[PDB]
Amino acid sequence: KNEVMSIDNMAGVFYMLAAAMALSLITFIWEHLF
Amino acid sequence: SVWVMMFVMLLIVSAIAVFVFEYFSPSFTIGKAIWLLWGLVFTTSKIMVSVWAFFAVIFLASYTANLAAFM
Amino acid sequence: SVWVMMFVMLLIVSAIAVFVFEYFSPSFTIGKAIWLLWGLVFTTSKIMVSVWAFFAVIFLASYTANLAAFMIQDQVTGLSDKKFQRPHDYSPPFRFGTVPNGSTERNIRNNYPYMHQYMTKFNQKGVEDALVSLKTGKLDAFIYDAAVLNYKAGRDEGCKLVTIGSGYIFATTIALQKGSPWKRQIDLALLQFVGDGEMEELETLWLTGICHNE
Amino acid sequence: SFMQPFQSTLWLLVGLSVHVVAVMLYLLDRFSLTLSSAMWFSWRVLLNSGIGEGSFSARILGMVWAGFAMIIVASYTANLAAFLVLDRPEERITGINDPRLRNPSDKFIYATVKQSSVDIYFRRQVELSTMYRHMEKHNYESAAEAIQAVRDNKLHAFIWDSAVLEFEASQKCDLVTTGELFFRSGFGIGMRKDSPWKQNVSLSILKSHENGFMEDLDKTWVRYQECDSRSTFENMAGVFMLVAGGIVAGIFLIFIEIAYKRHKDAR
Amino acid sequence: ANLAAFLVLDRPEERITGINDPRLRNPSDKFIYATVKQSSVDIYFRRQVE
């Protein structure tokens, strides 16, 4: 009977939140000391 | 390489419209140009980029239907 | 009543915005408030109404899904149509034919003689006459031995020729010489064979083509 | 149909991510407006009122939040199409070939009327032997008994008289004929063997078959009656409940909270 | 709606499921099937009937 389930719990956002925090780190380090 | 297509074509058309308004100069490039790109991903030649915005709805609808494919 | 629900709730929210204006008063309600309502159908309380805007996305998605409900999931009805019964009251006049001196011809001579005076311009000779004349559009459709037409239904190239309706049967319903001693035995036999399901084995052998696997 | 079916677990994850939005945007300020500005930029984009404009990097991350929001809304519209079209819709008995008759159960009870013709067509055939020790122990005595047993939600299904069932499906909205026919026979007249009334009666019968009197009774007693076929929802009703309650509850917070801010302005 | 529809729904394909298909049962000239002569498939066919 098409063995799927009857919501969704992919990882997804977790990788996307980690990418967003990574971008925050990649940006806010570059302070203009020169 | 869908994301590659997105970054490449947005870089191209963005640089286009920037130098378009630099010929208009008789608003910011790396400022407002990128934000108004991505804003309708989600003063007459501005319209010409928002043509993509209507296709962006299709680029919405495709990733509706594609996810409607996989879900 | 769905559109009624829309109008009623927007009247309520408009009244709410009017409250919020008249207690801002120590920018048009009647103007701009309705326009900004409908605008996100498709400065604090502006927010409280735009809460609906997020549900309006749901009121988007519902009428996506509802139409995703309805966009995922004949002509002649029978002998009682005066398409047959009045052919020259409709232009062009119709084209229907039968196999000459068949039983149905006798039954419609008992039914409609003037119709026979039309139908005699439409005789055929064989089966592929009917088949090609429908596949080339030389006649409109047919009325015959209908189970035979159900056989030839499931056999078509792409199955685009379907008989009358969904199996609605009109002019409905083994030969022995009279006085033979053979009635009772053969009847008992055949009612056993009907009774014990081997008729359905015959059905699986010879009846179906594509159409019952619709 | 429902409420929000989308995992109150995940709804708490979404709300705490809204807190992630707010906390991050107000922490990324002083790197170079500090109370509720970026709050309403955030709730403007994520809810979907404006996408509009309003150093580089916090605006970058806000566009990342727009990407989040569009992914999340796409996921919602995906599942809202999905569980209104797809699986777990129903479970419908298709015929004798189903295992619900073939492998019988106690939560599926089937019955007929004793001393009937269905008793005959069963007790003649073979491979439904396992049927009888169900099918003989729960029977009835008349048709209306079976009808009300469907009405009283006592019995699930019936194998019975096809014309009568097509009527009471077309009469009342409770009934559906499912599957093909079984034991295909005819309804006719009963006469004794020495009764001489065979032949002329049969003549009249074929006259009735050919002269449309069969169709006459099919019109005058058989073909009149139809019910609807599903052509203001519980989702709609639940949304008006939630949104009406929440916004009237918001109304009766606006006065007190802003009036205390009017006291702050009086300070 | 239609972009979801004609990426999910009907007219996707037509795939032969087995001997029970009419494409073997009612044979055609645009469907041609074959084997190797003097093989065991020749045997299991020429023994059975229908």
UniProtKB/Swiss-Prot annotation, chain B:
Listed transmembrane segments: 2-21, 44-64
Free-text domain note: Contains an N-terminal domain, a ligand-binding domain and a transmembrane domain. Agonist binding to the extracellular ligand-binding domains triggers channel gating. A hydrophobic region that gives rise to the prediction of a transmembrane span does not cross the membrane, but is part of a discontinuously helical region that dips into the membrane and is probably part of the pore and of the selectivity filter.
Effect on the protein of changing L67P: In FESD; likely pathogenic
Documented effect of changing L60R: In FESD; likely pathogenic; decreased localization to the cell membrane; results in increased agonist potency and channel activation at lower glutamate and glycine concentrations compared to wild type channels
Pathological association: Epilepsy, focal, with speech disorder and with or without impaired intellectual development: An autosomal dominant, highly variable neurologic disorder. Features range from severe early-onset seizures associated with delayed psychomotor development, persistent speech difficulties, and intellectual disability to a more benign entity characterized by childhood onset of mild or asymptomatic seizures associated with transient speech difficulties followed by remission of seizures in adolescence and normal psychomotor development. Rare genetic variations in GRIN2A may be associated with susceptibility to schizophrenia, a severe psychiatric disorder characterized by hallucinations, delusions, disorganized speech and behavior, cognitive impairment, and social withdrawal.
Location(s) in or outside the cell: Cell projection, Dendritic spine; Cell membrane; Synapse; Postsynaptic cell membrane
Region Pore-forming, residue ranges: 28-42
Intramembrane region residues: 30-42
Outcome of mutating L40Q: In FESD; likely pathogenic
Effect of S62G: In FESD; likely pathogenic; decreased localization to the cell membrane; results in increased agonist potency and channel activation at lower glutamate and glycine concentrations compared to wild type channels
Official protein name in the record: Glutamate receptor ionotropic, NMDA 2A
Entry function: Component of N-methyl-D-aspartate (NMDA) receptors (NMDARs) that function as heterotetrameric, ligand-gated cation channels with high calcium permeability and voltage-dependent block by Mg(2+). NMDARs participate in synaptic plasticity for learning and memory formation by contributing to the slow phase of excitatory postsynaptic current, long-term synaptic potentiation, and learning.
Family affiliation: Belongs to the glutamate-gated ion channel (TC 1.A.10.1) family. NR2A/GRIN2A subfamily.
Curated annotation (Swiss-Prot), chain E:
Glycan-linked positions: N26
Outcome following mutation: N2I: In NDHMSD; likely pathogenic; changed glutamate-gated calcium ion channel activity; mutant channels are activated at 100-fold lower glutamate concentrations and 30-fold lower glycine concentrations
Consequence of changing F6C: In NDHMSD; likely pathogenic; changed glutamate-gated calcium ion channel activity; mutant channels are activated at 13-fold lower glutamate concentrations and 9-fold lower glycine concentrations
Post-translational modification comment from the UniProt entry: NMDA is probably regulated by C-terminal phosphorylation of an isoform of GRIN1 by PKC. Its phosphorylated state is influenced by the formation of the NMDAR-PPP2CB complex and the NMDAR channel activity.
Effect recorded for A4T: In NDHMSD; uncertain significance
Organism superkingdom: Eukaryota
Positions that bind glycine: S40
Subcellular location: Cell membrane; Postsynaptic cell membrane; Postsynaptic density membrane; Synaptic cell membrane
Protein family per UniProt: Belongs to the glutamate-gated ion channel (TC 1.A.10.1) family. NR1/GRIN1 subfamily.
Subunit (UniProt): Heterotetramer; the NMDAR subunits are modular and harbor tiered domains that function in concert to regulate opening and closing of the cation-selective ion channel pore. Forms heterotetrameric channels composed of two GluN1/zeta subunits (GRIN1), and two identical GluN2/epsilon subunits (GRIN2A, GRIN2B, GRIN2C or GRIN2D) or GluN3 subunits (GRIN3A or GRIN3B) (in vitro). Can also form heterotetrameric channels that contain at least two GluN1 subunits and at least two different GluN2 subunits (or a combination of one GluN2 and one GluN3 subunits) (in vitro).
Disease field: Neurodevelopmental disorder with or without hyperkinetic movements and seizures, autosomal dominant: An autosomal dominant neurodevelopmental disorder characterized by severe intellectual disability and developmental delay, absent speech, muscular hypotonia, dyskinesia, and hyperkinetic movements. Cortical blindness, cerebral atrophy, and seizures are present in some patients. Neurodevelopmental disorder with or without hyperkinetic movements and seizures, autosomal recessive: An autosomal recessive neurodevelopmental disorder characterized by severe intellectual disability and psychomotor developmental delay, involuntary and stereotypic movements, spasticity, and inability to walk without support. Intractable seizures manifest in some patients.
Recorded domain comment: A hydrophobic region that gives rise to the prediction of a transmembrane span does not cross the membrane, but is part of a discontinuously helical region that dips into the membrane and is probably part of the pore and of the selectivity filter.
Protein name (Swiss-Prot/TrEMBL): Glutamate receptor ionotropic, NMDA 1
Native source organism of the sequence: Homo sapiens (Human)
